[PDB]
Amino acid sequence: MSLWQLETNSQQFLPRLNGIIIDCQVLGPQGNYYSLILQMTENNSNSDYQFLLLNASDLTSKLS
């Protein structure tokens, strides 16, 4: 997941997520939490969705 800083076009990353990111969102009055949807495409038999709520402070999984 890449945070693009548009002022200078820089960026920060959170790599090695459990799966590819179907969706992203900024969830909070101040953007405290990021809500992400992951897919885990390894399993082709079924679609394996995982909902992740990350604390924007230190980018640690608040709720998986």
The verdict on 2 binding another protein (CB under 8 A) reads: no
Of 6-14, 30-38, 40-48, 49-57, which segment contacts RNA by CB under 7 A?
6-14
DSSP conformation letters of 11-41: EEE----SS-EEEEEEESSS--EEEEEE--T
Task: Say if residues 55 and 62 touch (Cβ distance below 8 Å).
Answer: yes
Q: What is the C-alpha separation between 14 and 7, in angstroms, rounded?
A: 20
Binding site for another protein (CB under 8 A): 3, 5, 7-8, 10-12, 14-18, 20, 22-23, 25, 27-33, 35, 37, 40, 42-43, 46-53, 55-64
Binding site for RNA (CB under 7 A): 12-16, 59
